[PDB]
Amino acid sequence: GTEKTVKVIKDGPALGLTISDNGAGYAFIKKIREDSIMSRVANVAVGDHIAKINGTDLNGCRHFEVARMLKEIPIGSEFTMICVEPKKSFDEI
Numbered sequence: 001g002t003e004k005t006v007k008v009i010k011d012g013p014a015l016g017l018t019i020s021d022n023g024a025g026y027a028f029i030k031k032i033r034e035d036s037i038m039s040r041v042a043n044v045a046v047g048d049h050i051a052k053i054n055g056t057d058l059n060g061c062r063h064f065e066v067a068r069m070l071k072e073i074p075i076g077s078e079f080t081m082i083c084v085e086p087k088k089s090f091d092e093i
Contacts, residue, residue: 001084003051004043008081010073011037017070019050019063026051026059026084027066044083052082 008015016036021027026049032038052058053069073079 001049001086004048004083004085006041006044006081006083007078008037008041009078010075013075015070019067021061021063021066024060025049027061027063029083044081045085047086047088048083049086050081051084052080054079054081 014036016033016038017029018031018033019027020030028049029044029046032044032046038044050058050066053066056069058066058069070079
């Protein structure tokens with residue numbers, strides 16, 4: 001899948017993400033709340049898998065572990081997140 005670097009300022013206590021996992025692989029973004037920090041990030045989308053946060057490998061991690069890592073980031077801090085897009089249909093025209 002297409003790998004993307006997301007660099008974000010956590011300016012308040014909530015990023016706007018809903019994340020889940022299916023019991024294996026990576027946690028993924030299930031929802032991005034309208035008018036949120038993450039809705040304003042140009043290159044993150046519903047369906048993306050969260051591969052790393054701040055260089056930490058999150059392969060195999062449950063959504064509660066990934067969520068804890070995002071929640072713990074102090075307000076006012078920048079953070080980086082590596083997201084991987086799933087392979088879905090498209091058209092070239």
